[PDB]
């Protein structure tokens, strides 16, 4: 029915905008992020006593807004489960809710209602709204990428950590020995460790500095080595991030080929098996399916030199040399 | 031949799958849905726009010379089908097993009938091993 | 006419030096940049009260120089529109002026005349001369490249931003909790946020430092993570800049091939269609055109392995294997 | 043949396109401009310097043996023209359409006459589709 | 015997977990590292006088734990030498101990017993437990990689060192000249060198800053150059680490091919030479060996485009073109 | 003569160790560098008044050492010009000295003699010994590489400079506006520029910090952008250095092929033209030359995939497809 | 032939190398160890699982048609053996010397008898140089 | 033939270029220097060590069968010489000009006589253009 297909269209569209954004769909998630960010900022302001009544008023209003949007978010999201046999029916909606993020969405909902109803419990509930903030990335992507890259470049990272740690242990010791007496910053080796950490990371607060000439010489000498070493992981991770995401893009690109391949083989076998209602049907299916399917397959096939191009290259060449041998033995 | 001219008789009015030479995209889609195809309006439109002489649905059916006369034996077809198998032929060497064939056909893309897929596993290559040679399949579509 | 072609030559040359510099042409733009930079510096000096009269004198003289060069710049630029049918005639000059940078050039001109005529309006007009400074890059190139790269590596960047932001939120909270009592720098969570931002970026002013042992342990531990994370975008952008500009260079390189290709095909078809005034004409056109065109085409064809070399490789190989099949079926 | 020797008669003095064996680069350019070619002095100079025996314009016209005797059937020519089509043949497969041919000819490089471009779209390949085979064109210049 | 093969299995397993860890085997080394780290931390705590008696008690207990685990580590490790003819028999165990790390393990053992028996000697022995810490990486891997990369990128590194050093020498000189008089931080060129080192490394303690306008201008100008230059080695090393470890992974990957190749050739020659007890033997060896060996060889052969794929490509193509010539001369 | 060939050998060897070091030859240049570095350090020490007499004594002794080694360096270097017809004979030695570094070597020599003979002139001469230090890299390599890379990646660098400069201009302005009143660090826009430069480079001395909440918000916000931007050139240069030196290594590798190629072609043509004193001569030259020349050529030919391998690939394939066509037309 | 059917007589019960059609993996391993093979249980299991009809050891011995009927002349075999030589043939050109052959055989992988390795150095290629052509060896296994 | 056996007569004692079968590396070098070759001791040593039967200079001259019997027509030679031209043949297409030939021969590597280089520019390819085909040169050494 026209109402039925309007239902289906809005169903699917809101589902996509909520669960799997893309393009302008990000505007809604930007809205939610700004909402929660505003809640955090307004809480921070409420901490500053010298002006908090205005903050409290605006915070109550913002909490109303949060309560309504989050509840509507939940309901629309659950209803937005009519795009597959997967989460349909009452039981399907229940399984959709068992999905862990829907849970914490329910908890932030009830936390909001508790806050508006109403000091440990209050701090807890507000912390739950901050839980929504950390829940922003649902499908792990920021975490999965980070862990994947850290594991992949484990050797480099462990080298950097080991040498940096060991430089930090020894430089701190030597400087502490040099300045144990005159300088008062380095009263104990703990202080020297603090200084070494602040120095090798290039933070350099300057609350703890060498004073003796020997101390300064040692500090500079070890600084060169360390400074080089603690900055290393950032470079390693940057390179690894670029590489890993490039690989993901390539891989994700290949599945785009998967659909047309099925299209072509389904059309080909069905049409061949078939070969004037029936004849008009076969005519149309031949013409439309092939002209579309072959086309799309082709525009999906060409790019990415890496290994893809050379794989097709090798395949074609292999049968070519196979037939070189075959034709030569056929001649003589 | 007889079937070609007989279908051309309907094609003269159904170049856009209707009773009159026109754009007839929606009519074509409804007719196909009655036939059981149930296509999409956008799918019909893109197709009509691509292969066309008048480029407005009411083409002077040069597809009389396309559909029947073209044996669909273009080497582009063979290369395309080989590539289509490649994405499924992990490590190649006729990698497809009939199980994978039925899996893809009945679970992905257009979910063809399991009986049709069994007929595919029979006619295309009776052996039904994990090493079904792809040259036969591209010939199977083209010549065999 | 000789005067006419001198007119055309100077026309085109000044056009290129003003609008599309290259090689030594950059010297003039360096001159303009130093002029505007000197204006900025002299204004800064005029702010320093203890010596400003000399600054004002030199600034008036510099403003005369600016006024004359900018007006002449405008006139020469507009006149420098005789290189194509595009901006010729009175109406063409009008459309050349409608181009947005020519506008702001007119505004900086009138701002200069207003300054020499003559406190909000004065500050505005001087700000307009600074507008010229920001107008330096006309054709967006510094902006377009930056935006393009930021968008391309969006995943990496969002990961870094997300994790860094979240580390900054939590480290600041924990340190604030640890040092809420003893330390006086961390009077409120706002202060802790300030400290965390200054620390994780490795600025480290040192106005706000941890004092308790627990605070220092937390600060160092979180410092390691953060420091690694806030430094990440710089590495990502550096890699992306290199990659994007490399791609642009390749692409720009290919259009260099476009001209010779047309040359060859025009010469070939025309000469073939033609084939003793006419015979001498055909002789000369054959010899000169081909010997030049083929040559230049060739020197424009070879380099860039990437995909280019392998594309020509595949093309040649495809017809080779095509004929392998053809010859074998021709034999038997 | 008759035309070759007849043109060689003028070539004996016009090796640099003039009435006397000399560098005659400017004279050649002016003569071409009178003929309607209107070349550039730098263009004439580079060309004369490249293919030359004396290397000063007043070459002993070995181009008698170059122009007529060379059928311009060098495989380098065929490869070059194929590459020339490549830059315009996006995705290949005879990608050029006659519209693109006229566009490039009349809008870019040397803007040949639209009538000449129509004659190209006719003689080079009468079909005028988007799949004009390039082998015919390289033969068209070389042999066909 | 069943007891004999249990002996062999545990022998080999403990050998692998001690000498060549992999996967979950790292948990034991993590345990040891945490043990030694805890010893270091507890010593640091013992330095802090205001609470050291608890530290001493816990340190004595930890030293008992260290003594027992290290002694058992030694014994189990030496016994764990029954996996090859290499270190078997009493003499083999002696050679296993001559291996240098086993030595320092013995010294840390005896140092621990000396500490529990019992101020220079005590400091020495505790330093020996820290020697165990630095002994963590046995087979040099953190050191070998670092040295290899430093040597490989020697040119880049020397450029950075040279220019950075020279900028540091001259900037310090000029700033010292500018601020010799007014500023009191720059009392002598030594002080200026200290300032320059702290500045160019971006530590910036802030104990020594320029004050005169000229000094600040010089400091900023030179800062730009230097700051760029001292940060360079970290980037170079990061790239080199990634590259070198990638190369090592590729190389290590190729030896994985070495075993199957021998398997295939041994099976092939033996089976061919052989070709119904004998016939059943040949049947089984044919079937099982080939079906396994060829398989494994194949899964070990395909990946890594780099040079590997193109090497196989070239090899196959070389004999193909060889036979092109051969067949053509055979035809005519 | 045996004395004559000893002369030639030592000639060439000392020439190589002085002018073109390699391997252990660097030890001598390390010696010279440590000598000049020690002179610099001892001068610095002589500045520190509270102990300078010892410094002066050791400096006089070091100056004797410098004088003798530098004079001997000069003489040995000039004499070390007997390895080619290039710098032989009295006139050849004169041209060897006209080479600019030999000049400044002469000046540092005479500066040393002036110092030992003996306040502006003295400071000058000591500065000349520092000139020797900067002369360390003779053949420009640290400078040539830096300039080459800066020019190659000009686009990226200008983007970074432009955006960073413009962020620095505006952030400084806004912060100055925010804190013009309360804060006393930002008394004038000059001060704000100083603060902005120290902040965006992540030095962060901390002498100038924001105090108002608005100032801090602006400072942090702009810090994020800037900090990212000023760190960019270091990454760009690191990548460019790696890339450029890799290219140089490849290029330098190819000339290694140049010698064997000449060897092979000289041997081949000479031996062919020749084809039993003469027969024994031809026999020996054939056998020895070819077995050596072909060998060495081969070990010099294979590596470097990049373009080299694919260039040989394409060449061989081109004649292969050429003969495919030829053989097919020969058959039919 | 006679030997094939004679071995098939035992194979009918020893499809898993035993006296009864069963999984008989451990029995097969013990029988091989008695024969002197001394295999591993995991090695036997993987092998049985791979090539199998029933896929449980008690396959209906289609390996009667595998072992004897398959001449082991598959081009995959030739390519595999060529690749196997490649990893040992540094710089190629028949790089293997008989010394390297004996070294690898007697020091790595399965340590075959030195007499067997000498017989390999004799039969496979009598020349025993550092340039033993690999085409003969792949034929030596396949055809030669 | 006559010359081969005549040279073998001296070779029986001059396998290391002397009067007795020995290492005779220094004697060989001195003899060559007398002949005008003037080789290096290290150059002689490496060569003797490479191609050898006894591997100590006093080889049982299997180079009787190497030098004369080997026509030096190995395809490795042709490939090597082609590669040798490649490094000098910038952009290929017979890129070498006789000027470049004389330049390299007389300025680099072994500085052969200018007369010998002129004889090379004549015999190897009389044309002396910038497009001297390399196939003739590799044949010129091998067969032509
Ligand atoms: C003046 C000037 C201002 C300057 C700024 C300019 C702004 C630039 C914004 C540019 C980009 C627009 C957004 C584009 C965008 O989101 O790009 C996405 C990355 O998305 C995420 O990582 C997903 C989201 C993860 C993180 C969510 C929370 C992030 C909060 C950030 C807070 C930052 C606070 C900032 C404060 C700084 C420190 C105080 C790349 O999209 P894509 O092209 O890679 O395609 C997607 C994408 O990769 C998805 O991540 C991926 O799913 P995941 O598994 O979740 O990764 C899809 O695969 P599947 O379909 O198979 O699942 C892919 O199909
Ligand atoms: C909140 C969040 C917390 C965030 C952190 C998440 C943690 C991440 C941990 C991830 C990785 C798990 C460990 C994996 C792992 O160890 O990866 C290894 C690297 O191992 C070493 O370098 C060997 C060990 C060398 C260093 C030993 C001491 C290290 C002490 C580190 C102390 C760091 C202190 C931290 C304080 C920081 C500063 C105060 C890569 O393993 P692989 O896949 O490369 O394979 C091995 C490996 O490369 C071996 O290194 C190599 O032998 P070597 O010659 O010794 O290199 C093998 O070759 P062969 O069999 O031919 O000998 C390879 O077969
Ligand atoms: K910093
Ligand atoms: K700092
Ligand atoms: K800092
Ligand atoms: K600081």
UniProtKB/Swiss-Prot annotation, chains A, C, E, F:
* Record's miscellaneous remark: Mutagenesis experiments were carried out by expressing in Xenopus oocytes KCNQ4 mutants either individually (homomultimers) or in combination with wild-type KCNQ4 (mut/wt homomultimers) in a ratio of 1:1, to mimic the situation in a heterozygous DFNA2 patient.
How does the entry describe the domains? Each channel subunit contains six transmembrane segments (S1-S6) with S1-S4 forming one voltage sensing domain (VSD) and S5-S6 contributing to form one quarter of an interlocking pore-forming domain (PD).
Outcome reported for the amino acid change (mutating residue 181 to G): No effect on inhibition by potassium channel toxin SsTX
Q: What is the lineage of its organism?
A: Eukaryota, Metazoa, Chordata, Craniata, Vertebrata
The residue spans the entry assigns to the Extracellular side of the membrane are as follows 46-56, 178-189, 212
Residue spans that sit within the membrane without traversing it, per the record: 190-211
Summarize where a 1,2-diacyl-sn-glycero-3-phospho-(1D-myo-inositol-4,5-bisphosphate) 2 binds, as residue positions.
139, 154, 249, 252
The effect of residue 180 to G is: No effect on inhibition by potassium channel toxin SsTX
Q: What is the effect of changing residue 249 to A?
A: Shifted activation curve of KCNQ4 toward positive potentials compared to wild-type. Decreased current density
Span within the parent record: 74 to 584 of 695
| UniProt-reported outcome of changing residue 51 to G | No effect on inhibition by potassium channel toxin SsTX
Q: Tell me the impact of changing residue 204 to S.
A: In DFNA2A; dominant negative effect; abolishes potassium current
Which disorder does the record name? Deafness, autosomal dominant, 2A: A form of non-syndromic sensorineural hearing loss. Sensorineural deafness results from damage to the neural receptors of the inner ear, the nerve pathways to the brain, or the area of the brain that receives sound information.
Report the transmembrane regions from the record. 24-45, 57-79, 96-118, 122-142, 155-177, 213-241
Impact of changing residue 144 to A on the protein? Shifted activation curve of KCNQ4 toward positive potentials compared to wild-type. No difference in current density
Q: What is the effect of changing residue 135 to G?
A: No effect on inhibition by potassium channel toxin SsTX
Residues the record lists as binding a 1,2-diacyl-sn-glycero-3-phospho-(1D-myo-inositol-4,5-bisphosphate) 1: 20, 99, 138-139, 144
Q: Where in the cell is it found?
A: Basal cell membrane
The record's account of tissue expression is: Expressed in the outer, but not the inner, sensory hair cells of the cochlea. Slightly expressed in heart, brain and skeletal muscle.
* UniProt-reported outcome of changing residue 155 to A: Loss of detectable current
User: What is the protein named?
Assistant: Potassium voltage-gated channel subfamily KQT member 4
Swiss-Prot record, chains B, D, G, H:
Q: Which organism is it from?
A: Homo sapiens (Human)
* GO terms of molecular function: adenylate cyclase activator activity; adenylate cyclase binding; calcium channel regulator activity; calcium ion binding; calcium-dependent protein binding; nitric-oxide synthase binding; nitric-oxide synthase regulator activity; phosphatidylinositol 3-kinase binding
As annotated, the Glycyl lysine isopeptide (Lys-Gly) (interchain with G-Cter in SUMO2) covalent link is placed at 17
Post-translational events:
Ubiquitination results in a strongly decreased activity.
Q: What is the designated name of this protein?
A: Calmodulin-3
- What InterPro entries is this protein classified in? CALM/Myosin/TropC-like, EF-hand-dom_pair, EF_Hand_1_Ca_BS, EF_hand_dom
Q: Any additional notes?
A: This protein has four functional calcium-binding sites.
Stated family: Belongs to the calmodulin family.
